[PDB]
Amino acid sequence: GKLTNGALEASNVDLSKELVNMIVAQRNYQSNAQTIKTQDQILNTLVNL
Amino acid sequence: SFSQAVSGLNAAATNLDVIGNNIANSATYGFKSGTASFADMFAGSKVGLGVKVAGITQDFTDGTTTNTGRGLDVAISQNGFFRLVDSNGSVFYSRNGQFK
Amino acid sequence: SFSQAVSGLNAAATNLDVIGNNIANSATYGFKSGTASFADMFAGSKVGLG
Amino acid sequence: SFSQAVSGLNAAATNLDVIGNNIANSATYGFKSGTASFADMFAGSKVGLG
Amino acid sequence: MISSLWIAKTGLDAQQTNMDVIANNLANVSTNGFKRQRAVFEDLLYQTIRQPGAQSSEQTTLPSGLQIGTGVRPVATERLHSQGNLSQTNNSKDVAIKGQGFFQVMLPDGTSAYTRDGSFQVDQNGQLVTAGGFQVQPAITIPANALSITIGRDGVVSVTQQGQAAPVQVGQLNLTTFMNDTGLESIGENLYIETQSSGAPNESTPGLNGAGLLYQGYVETSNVNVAEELVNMIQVQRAYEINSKAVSTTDQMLQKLTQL
Amino acid sequence: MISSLWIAKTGLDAQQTNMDVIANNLANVSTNGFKRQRAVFEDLLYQTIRQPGAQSSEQTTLPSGLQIGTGVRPVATERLHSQGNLSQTNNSKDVAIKGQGFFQVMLPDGTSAYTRDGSFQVDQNGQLVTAGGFQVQPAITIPANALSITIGRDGVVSVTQQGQAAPVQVGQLNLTTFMNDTGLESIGENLYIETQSSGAPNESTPGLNGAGLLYQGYVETSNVNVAEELVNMIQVQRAYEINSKAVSTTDQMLQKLTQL
Amino acid sequence: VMLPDGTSAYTRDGSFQVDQNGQLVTAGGFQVQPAITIPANALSITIGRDGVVSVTQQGQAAPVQVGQLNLTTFMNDTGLESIGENLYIETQSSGAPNESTPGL
Amino acid sequence: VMLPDGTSAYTRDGSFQVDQNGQLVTAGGFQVQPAITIPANALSITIGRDGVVSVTQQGQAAPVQVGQLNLTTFMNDTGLESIGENLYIETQSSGAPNESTPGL
Numbered sequence A: 001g002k003l004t005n006g007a008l009e010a011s012n013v014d015l016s017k018e019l020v021n022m023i024v025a026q027r028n029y030q031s032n033a034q035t036i037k038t039q040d041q042i043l044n045t046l047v048n049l
Numbered sequence B: 001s002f003s004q005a006v007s008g009l010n011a012a013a014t015n016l017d018v019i020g021n022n023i024a025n026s027a028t029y030g031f032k033s034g035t036a037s038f039a040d041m042f043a044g045s046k047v048g049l050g051v052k053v054a055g056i057t058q059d060f061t062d063g064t065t066t067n068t069g070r071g072l073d074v075a076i077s078q079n080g081f082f083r084l085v086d087s088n089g090s091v092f093y094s095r096n097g098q099f100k
Numbered sequence C, D: 001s002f003s004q005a006v007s008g009l010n011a012a013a014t015n016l017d018v019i020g021n022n023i024a025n026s027a028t029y030g031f032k033s034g035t036a037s038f039a040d041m042f043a044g045s046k047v048g049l050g
Numbered sequence E, F: 001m002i003s004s005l006w007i008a009k010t011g012l013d014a015q016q017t018n019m020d021v022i023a024n025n026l027a028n029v030s031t032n033g034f035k036r037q038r039a040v041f042e043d044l045l046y047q048t049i050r051q052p053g054a055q056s057s058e059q060t061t062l063p064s065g066l067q068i069g070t071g072v073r074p075v076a077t078e079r080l081h082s083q084g085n086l087s088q089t090n091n092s093k094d095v096a097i098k099g100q101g102f103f104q105v106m107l108p109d110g111t112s113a114y115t116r117d118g119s120f121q122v123d124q125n126g127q128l129v130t131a132g133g134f135q136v137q138p139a140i141t142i143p144a145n146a147l148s149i150t151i152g153r154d155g156v157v158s159v160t161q162q163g164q165a166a167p168v169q170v171g172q173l174n175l176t177t178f179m180n181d182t183g184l185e186s187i188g189e190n191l192y193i194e195t196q197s198s199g200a201p202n203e204s205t206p207g208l209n210g211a212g213l214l215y216q217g218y219v220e221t222s223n224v225n226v227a228e229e230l231v232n233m234i235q236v237q238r239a240y241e242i243n244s245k246a247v248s249t250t251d252q253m254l255q256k257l258t259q260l
Numbered sequence G, H: 001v002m003l004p005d006g007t008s009a010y011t012r013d014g015s016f017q018v019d020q021n022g023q024l025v026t027a028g029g030f031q032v033q034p035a036i037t038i039p040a041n042a043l044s045i046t047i048g049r050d051g052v053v054s055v056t057q058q059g060q061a062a063p064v065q066v067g068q069l070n071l072t073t074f075m076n077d078t079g080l081e082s083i084g085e086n087l088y089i090e091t092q093s094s095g096a097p098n099e100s101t102p103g104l
Helices: A017-047 B001-022 C003-024 D003-024 E003-027 E225-257 F003-027 F226-258
Strands: A004-007 B034-040 B052-060 B074-076 B080-083 B093-096 E037-043 E046-050 E066-069 E072-080 E093-096 E103-108 E112-113 E120-121 E128-130 E150-152 E156-160 E168-172 E176-177 E184-187 E191-193 E203-204 E211-216 F037-043 F046-050 F066-069 F072-080 F084-086 F093-100 F103-106 F112-115 F120-122 F128-130 F148-151 F156-160 F168-172 F176-177 F185-187 F191-192 F202-204 F211-216 F218-219 G016-018 G024-026 G042-047 G051-058 G064-068 G071-074 G079-085 G087-091 G098-100 H015-017 H024-026 H044-046 H053-055 H064-068 H071-073 H081-082 H087-090 H098-101
Touching: A004 F072, A017 B001, A017 E003, A017 E225, A017 F226, B001 B034, B001 E003, B080 E066, C003 F084, E003 E037, E003 E072, E003 F185, E066 E103, E103 E176, E120 E176, E128 H098, E150 E211, F003 F037, F003 F072, F003 F226, F128 G064, F211 G087, H071 H098
Parallel strands: F093 F218
Antiparallel strands: A004 B074, B034 B052, B080 B093, E037 E072, E046 E066, E093 E211, E103 E112, E112 E191, E120 E128, E150 E156, E156 E168, E176 E203, E184 E191, F037 F072, F046 F066, F084 F218, F093 F211, F103 F112, F112 F191, F120 F128, F148 F156, F156 F168, F176 F202, F185 F191, G016 G024, G042 G051, G051 G064, G071 G098, G079 G087, H015 H024, H044 H053, H053 H064, H081 H087
């Protein structure tokens, strides 16, 4: 590419894109973490008998 | 069933961690945002082994140039890099344009 | 995994300090403006550390 | 089902940025105004995917 | 040592398999080009104490026989090759396939596999490869000093060189369709290979013979419905608890019988 | 007194060691420069009632023998010398090491220990000592009336006095590495000493022969992640409960045997 | 794995450490048969999908192979005598082991 | 089931292993009479509902037929003389066996 004197680049990061993806990621973690809790109680019921 | 869930739990954490990294490095000059990608894994058939991280890729779309004044700076309009050398003889490639 | 946010918050607050100092010290004859500079870090895996 | 909301936000953001680009490039001699055009998507069954 | 105990054990195993497939589906909800799994069972054999419709006398027949089940058996955990939502990424080296078909990939050992997730990179040699080092079967090679890479609606792919005032075609991405898409056995890293269940694959250009269309800049997400995975998990948990209750009841009655 | 009871006792002991390791890892989640530890087991011997692959007849061989396990033994508890994260402490006398290597230190008796800590202070006599009273082996001293101490990316450390308009070099912070960092045995107050498992220490300036680099004003946090520790606690608790239930079943079986 | 007496055992337990000489030994002090010697001053160690094991060093801007990890299969893996510390020794019921590179 | 001395015996307990030569044998070294041989380095074995059995190779996508697993019936099962090793031997009370394919 062609150089340009007296200039600098931005971060090419869009806060609107990143913030919404953080909402989606958090729910995926909780939904996965729900499975661990469910599996623990499945084993918990079996042990107590 | 912990094996499937724990692997998925780690994958979600890694995805969240990368988002935090992309959101903290904002306003950095020579920075390209990165995203992670996953891929399932089955031992044979009908059996699931969870999910693993399939590498982290960086989007090299050029950012918007800024007229920060000064004389000892330069931004590359298109694809390209600056070649930098360390005192030990290593070679490092950078996109930032802060020179002193 | 608070290392990402706590590093970002310190950098962001420091930028406010630099901007605040520049605007506060306006109309000072022998004053030269300042500006911060950032740089990402990578210790181990490809995931950043702030 | 965050796909539709995410797609809607990105489409809305793109429209705003293009509008910002057109007003920012005012008082420029050799410039032609820009405008973004959208199009819906359908791949499932009678439900808009964004 | 009891038929009831064995039946309850089979039921517990079936519910465990159902829970495992639900957990696996929930795990990789963010995996691109992922088709969820559904497990289907069936009833096991029956012991016939009295034959149904038995000739009970010279002129009368039993309206219904006496049959006792032997439990349940999981038939298979099939994969639902549904259609996933197309996201937006605005990249240049990833294509999403809308419709039916797969991309052909040359595995290192020499055989060929088929994939549904389109996110291509370039190796150091300049040929188009997927995430994992596998190179595409038609061996599309991207030349150096490439200004941009464009992929049309059909399989034709062109690259804009430094000059020449015209893009130049570099190859074509034919995609292969199957007859029994749900019969392809799955290996890791979003790959499929053919078996006797699926017919002989037929390769074709996109948009013909029922094939899909290639959109550049998008990506195919997983078709996992987390909104209903949770309620399925609730039902699975309740069934598992009730089967455990049945096992406990059998143990109690055996104990209070042997206490004589 | 019985084989099942002894096997269950060994299993309980293994799970107790695992729980202790988890608790110790979680306790010092905020200690600077801490490297977590992981416990590794391996099963004990097997009593062979019938030799596997034995010659049962003139030509027939047993496809599989009869073997009974004796339990599980915890083979080791190894440190995981990963790379800890770094933070901004903003102290002139705080250093963090990126990569691999250790800071040498001299014990009061005379031997040498190795550490990963960075909170460097000054003794009453002006010698650079760590938190605890130990002083670095190369014997770096800080003169009085010192304005600022600057430690470069490599091992050179300089100080500035009131005048002279130029820094003066004081010493070099050479750091030592080992062939097998995992074999170092830990001792109290965040120190490591050389053993036979690890090789003879090799000393070098930072940035050469694979050694790390020094960053002034930072501090390295422990390499412990709280997310997976809780799920490990859940799993180890369930395993411990299962082993206890096995002990209970063995005791009940024996009691019903001896009730005669 | 080569036992100290001279014979060879087999294992599936993946937990590799390095002795003071840099050899890649299993957890317990037994070295792998091909004797993969990890050199010192190693910035990083990587193991590919196949048996190739490479090390990224301080310079030379290129990973260098230091060995390979082949694995041996048996005709019938059930009939393997099981000594302690996660080791198996071949018997008559299991045919002579055949070594191979991974993935083939 | 083929006894070592040459005679044939019949059993119902289905729990098979694989010998070092690939012959499908039961727990005890006795090999199945139709001589179902499994070739080496077989990915997996699939036995149909009928008497067909086939293993799968790597990079073939076509299971290979290895044999037919027939089972024999009797006029009167009660008349079989039970011996050790969980096996039955025909007698005069039960008629001669008539081997037939499964499902027919």
